[PDB]
Design a protein around this ligand. Structure first.
Ligand SMILES: C[C@@H]1O[C@@H](O)[C@@H](O)[C@H](O)[C@@H]1O
Ligand SMILES: C[C@@H]1O[C@@H](O)[C@@H](O)[C@H](O)[C@@H]1O
Ligand SMILES: C[C@@H]1O[C@@H](O)[C@@H](O)[C@H](O)[C@@H]1O
Ligand SMILES: C[C@@H]1O[C@@H](O)[C@@H](O)[C@H](O)[C@@H]1O
Ligand SMILES: C[C@@H]1O[C@H](O)[C@@H](O)[C@H](O)[C@@H]1O
Ligand SMILES: C[C@@H]1O[C@H](O)[C@@H](O)[C@H](O)[C@@H]1O
Ligand SMILES: C[C@@H]1O[C@H](O)[C@@H](O)[C@H](O)[C@@H]1O
Ligand SMILES: C[C@@H]1O[C@H](O)[C@@H](O)[C@H](O)[C@@H]1O
Ligand SMILES: C[C@@H]1O[C@H](O)[C@@H](O)[C@H](O)[C@@H]1O
Ligand SMILES: C[C@@H]1O[C@H](O)[C@@H](O)[C@H](O)[C@@H]1O
Ligand SMILES: C[C@@H]1O[C@H](O)[C@@H](O)[C@H](O)[C@@H]1O
Ligand SMILES: C[C@@H]1O[C@H](O)[C@@H](O)[C@H](O)[C@@H]1O
Ligand SMILES: C[C@@H]1O[C@H](O)[C@@H](O)[C@H](O)[C@@H]1O
Ligand SMILES: C[C@@H]1O[C@H](O)[C@@H](O)[C@H](O)[C@@H]1O
Ligand SMILES: C[C@@H]1O[C@H](O)[C@@H](O)[C@H](O)[C@@H]1O
Ligand SMILES: C[C@@H]1O[C@H](O)[C@@H](O)[C@H](O)[C@@H]1O
Lengths: 354, 354, 354, 354
């Protein structure tokens, strides 16, 4: 692979509803967003069926739960501006129409919740810089003007809250290295300069928080293996060295923290099946990758159920959405085999960044 | 102290709003509930002033945030039944009137959020058993009938979610030991039998979750010192031995998990000042207690701000509410000295359990 | 029990030979020291039989392995002075006669190895202060003069190396609290002043090193339960608060670090059987005590075999030495039941400190 | 670099004497072994000066301390057989002549101490298999016959005790992967078959024990960076995945466990200076490499002083031995700059394995 490659992304965005039911969002062959959901937060739950939002879209959709429980989806439109829609009541299938947030968008949108309850969206803009826009009041349809954070992006952005409430954004730069920028006071429009974490990544970065409040970042490297880095913590503003893990992966990775507090990472492997690795102990070494039966056609998208059970979604060879999950909450739970969520097929609507 | 004593409780209940502003609830000399809140989730924020809910009450009030962000308060009424009121919109000072949930209540109420978004309330009933009632749909004013969990309670109940979504309830029993009972499937009406954790406690139990998903319980013991016990974990249904910490305490303890993942405990000490102890490392030993200047007249009530800063509320010698807090998010942050939240005085409305 | 009680001690001293065979030393009804050893460092090993050192003694004997592998035993004599004898070659049953080190001794002797290979002995002296004497060259029969470290002791001393090579000595003081004093430079005659760790202990203190280089001290408390305290570490000269563990114990405790790095403690329990508790995780909480069948008449003495298997020695109701051990090296190994090491009976020769 | 390269090795072997004084062994331009030692185990200690053992040698020498404190050195002779010499008394400069152990040796020798006090030596033999020979009685000049462990070696062997007393040997195989073989009962002639840890290493393997009893192995990889792997533990016979650390290294690595229980690794870096990395927390992530001033001409050899202070030895550009060390025992201690141990120059006598 080339240093400037971006690994295959996930095919849906997933969220937990206010009642913790999983709900997924993808783009079908009509270039419209469709969604589907569990009807109950139970291990046996049926799924409602695929329901369409009217409107042609031009990016992967991004979803986040508002601080009042209402889901809200962000997507690029036919006019290359940002659009969004939302549940008008938590846990209810009453949605707004797509509504305009304007701007000129050249990446998939990335949405984060500030620690004061206000949603905030990050995109690459028409000048390849990072731009953002936010709710000016928690869970309200009052949005700011667009504002630039500068930089030159060559990946989609990835945003995450630090334990102290400061949003931090990660993105690949013009030199194919991982760069990052952050709020310097929680949920305030006060930002750092861009700083480089070095190395070379060949996927979007993926970021998760450890129990102990340290951010950890995962990405595919130049040699096509998983690599990761973490904050040193203790009021330090330093990071660890990079480590790679053996095993060639062929999609973006997806990270999750299990209910035991340990990290797990999923990715499509060299044989195009789903691979999983997990920390064997607190901060510990990582297990050899383990494989699930079945060839997959997207990166995994990983979520957790109301009872902590991990669930994974992927594009199948039939171009439909499949999922599998842990049967019980235990960290040693067995897993199901891939099952179909049928009724539509999906396309990869991700913005082509080059 | 006698084995059957119940240590002095906190004087307010505290919650985070959907936007993470702190809001406190207490009972004034008119035997009505009043509340006060931060106007913004900032370290410098002013407080709105004391506002009254009309209605005479006969217990300490209990507050919880619904899964749609709306706060909801539970209290015993003049008729010894359960009453509740709620914000009609998240982050808004538009409240319902007190509305009836009926029942015969002989303890302070305790409220928990199930992992499927439904509030659930636990009380001691007219026959001294544990009784509960719940929302039948997430964040909706549809409630179940009252149902008995049996037992004989001599403390208020304390409820907490396990990492796998199962509510677990702790309460002192007829033998003055700590007992507990739990959902055996997450957010389902399937409960265990009562089981004893043994020992003798002289306060309500206080329960918190560790990073690694293990519950930890704190209480004052027969010798008036803090003692604690924790789940062994690893799909075990066993608990650790009890450990006590040196230092005589004179109120209920209050536990909090800081943004570094470590536990801290606050309690009024033998000299009637606020004492604090913290885990020195991951699961580690506990620090010697450290003292804050100022004589206090209630147990502490502890909360965290939107940026992770710990904040403590207590009754003063003037019978008014005071608070102090960490000045920065760091675990080594300095602390302020007690400041007054003036305008009313408070009484301890806790139900007298004997 | 009274605050000034000293819990029943172990009946033998145990050491590993240069080849790691266990060897035990006790006092028989002739008031002479006898010893016995494994003939091979194997799980099935026979024991050689009881062999007598000629000479009447007046304390429990203390044994340590020199830095050249030779065992060396220290004891108080009929003249109340210190005497010692030694293997003249490692792993060989060729011993010196008892040889004089003089002094006036009013406690059992305690021996430690400095980090530069020189043995050092600590005793309470005729004026109740701590006194010490040392090899002036590693593993050589050249000893210093007696020198005083001051203080007032009401227990036998317990000495242990810090991770940085500094000997630290623990002993109960005139106020029945735990006190300690330490080298301020490794293996040098430069010592701190006495400092109090506070509390009240009713046994000799027992000290062990954690993996992470922090000393941890165990003792019985005023309420007859096990209590413990540890160094905070990180170049701090502070200690944790004291914690007690539920369960009444009736002898001195014995601590050991298993080959997994976790601490375990053994003690005679309230029912006069052997009890065991272990840390359930890294620095973690402690297990409920578990009991071994059989009434015992001394504190346990605990050792580790060449393969890490834990082995325990106690006085039986027949006044003979019994032992049991782990059958395999695993931390979850099963245990044998008490077996007799027959041929002599033993007395408790410990110096009566009052 | 090629997959079959073996990274530059250290220029001396180092041991602690019975009194913990450091002593180093190297080969000079006369192809004889010389040694030098600290005169006292102190931070300021002078060194004795270079002293020659008569006899021409044909490998790097290997040194180990016997279980009776006497150092013993192993080397290949002019006849390609194994030779050894020893201190005849601990801590004394009275040495045997080189004495024969015979055999046909095609690697540097590697020496380990069994958990029953018997030295054991591992070499590649005339048929490229692993061969070994051992003391049949602890610290005695009675040796076994040579015996084969099979395999095909392309690196020098590296041997280490498991926490349970079983020797484990690591060596690169015919496929350039890391292989290992182990005693299946502690200090017994009962061995496993060879098993592969996979990957590709371009240096000798280096093995150390973690506090928690798990072996960890370090080696340079095919991409010239440091990589490492560890035992999973918990009576499992599994290992972690491999991880690499960013940073090109140009010698064998040297690992050490500091007195805080954390691992540190030293290696010559891409700019031919000494680099150091350390675990930032328990099992934690690894720091970015830090550099010491000065170009070096060998891998580092790392030791610990009697007080825990880390000390490093390297070949200088003048072909003499240099060292630097921590000034205090603290983990954050400052370091000295390179100082000369003058009087001879050294050559790399390592056996050329191809
Ligand atoms: C995001 C970063 O912004 C500037 O610093 C560029 O010079 C970097 O190459 C990178 O694109
Ligand atoms: C809550 C518990 O319920 C029953 O088991 C009683 O026998 C106990 O004493 C306790 O009150
Ligand atoms: C060992 C200690 O030495 C002195 O400080 C005494 O005052 C203490 O009581 C204690 O005995
Ligand atoms: C040491 C190992 O021994 C055999 O298994 C060989 O097939 C391997 O290639 C390796 O050399
Ligand atoms: C998502 C939105 O759907 C609408 O129908 C379009 O008119 C907008 O341009 C945008 O594409
Ligand atoms: C997303 C932002 O929208 C604005 O309208 C543009 O002017 C900016 O360059 C950027 O593209
Ligand atoms: C995940 C499923 O595995 C099967 O082998 C495929 O045939 C399906 O299309 C799908 O990819
Ligand atoms: C809290 C409620 O306030 C109301 O005014 C009363 O009528 C009810 O009895 C109850 O006390
Ligand atoms: C709280 C419950 O209310 C019901 O009405 C009573 O019948 C129960 O005994 C219990 O007190
Ligand atoms: C906390 C405050 O400390 C002061 O000393 C008291 O005078 C106030 O009443 C209040 O208790
Ligand atoms: C241990 C020593 O044994 C000898 O026989 C005695 O003479 C000494 O006094 C001392 O008791
Ligand atoms: C052990 C020491 O021996 C010396 O001879 C005595 O003078 C001291 O007081 C002390 O007893
Ligand atoms: C440990 C052994 O247990 C048995 O019950 C006793 O009869 C023996 O004397 C001995 O104490
Ligand atoms: C190390 C030994 O030194 C001796 O002098 C030689 O005779 C042997 O062959 C061997 O080299
Ligand atoms: C080291 C061993 O020495 C023996 O003499 C040889 O026969 C073996 O092949 C091997 O080289
Ligand atoms: C370590 C020392 O650093 C210096 O720069 C060199 O000149 C010396 O030869 C030696 O290598």
């Amino acid at each position: 692979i080339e240093n400037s490659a971006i690994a295959l992304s996930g095919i849906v965005s997933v969220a937990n509803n206010a009642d913790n039911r999983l709900e997924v969002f993808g783009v079908s062959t009509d270039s419209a967003v469709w969604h589907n959901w569990q009807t109950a937060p139970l291990p046996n739950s049926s799924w409602a069926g695929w329901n369409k939002f009217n409107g042609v879209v031009t990016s992967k959709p991004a979803v986040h739960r508002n601080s009042d429980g209402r889901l809200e989806v962000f997507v690029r439109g036919t006019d290359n501006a940002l659009w969004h829609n939302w549940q008008t009541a938590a846990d209810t299938n009453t949605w707004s129409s797509w509504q305009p947030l304007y701007g000129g968008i050249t990446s998939n949108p990335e949405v984060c919740l500030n620690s004061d309850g206000r949603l905030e969206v990050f995109v690459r803009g028409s000048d390849n810089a990072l731009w953002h826009i936010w709710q000016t009041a928690a869970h309200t349809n009052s949005w700011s003007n667009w504002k630039s954070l500068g930089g030159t992006l060559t990946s989609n952005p990835a945003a995450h809250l630090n334990a102290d409430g400061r949003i931090e954004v990660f993105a690949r730069g013009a030199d194919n290295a991982l760069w990052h920028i952050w709020q310097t006071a929680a949920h305030t429009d006060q930002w750092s300069n861009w700083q480089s974490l070095k190395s070379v990544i060949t996927s979007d970065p993926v970021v998760i928080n450890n129990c102990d409040g340290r951010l950890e970042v995962f990405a595919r490297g130049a040699d096509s293996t998983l690599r990761h880095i973490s904050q040193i913590g203790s009021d330090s503003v330093s990071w660890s060295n990079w480590q790679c893990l053996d095993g060639v992966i062929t999609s973006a990775p997806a990270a999750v923290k299990n209910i035991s507090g340990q990290l797990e990472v999923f990715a499509r492997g060299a044989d195009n099946t789903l691979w999983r690795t997990w920390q064997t102990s607190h901060n510990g070494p990582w297990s050899n990758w383990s494989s699930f039966t079945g060839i997959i056609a997207s990166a995994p998208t990983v979520a957790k159920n109301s009872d902590g059970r991990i669930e994974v979604f992927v594009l199948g060879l039939d171009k439909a959405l499949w999922h599998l999950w842990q049967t019980t909450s235990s960290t040693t739970s067995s897993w199901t085999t891939w099952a179909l969520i049928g009724g539509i097929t999906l396309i990869d609507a991700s913005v082509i960044l080059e």
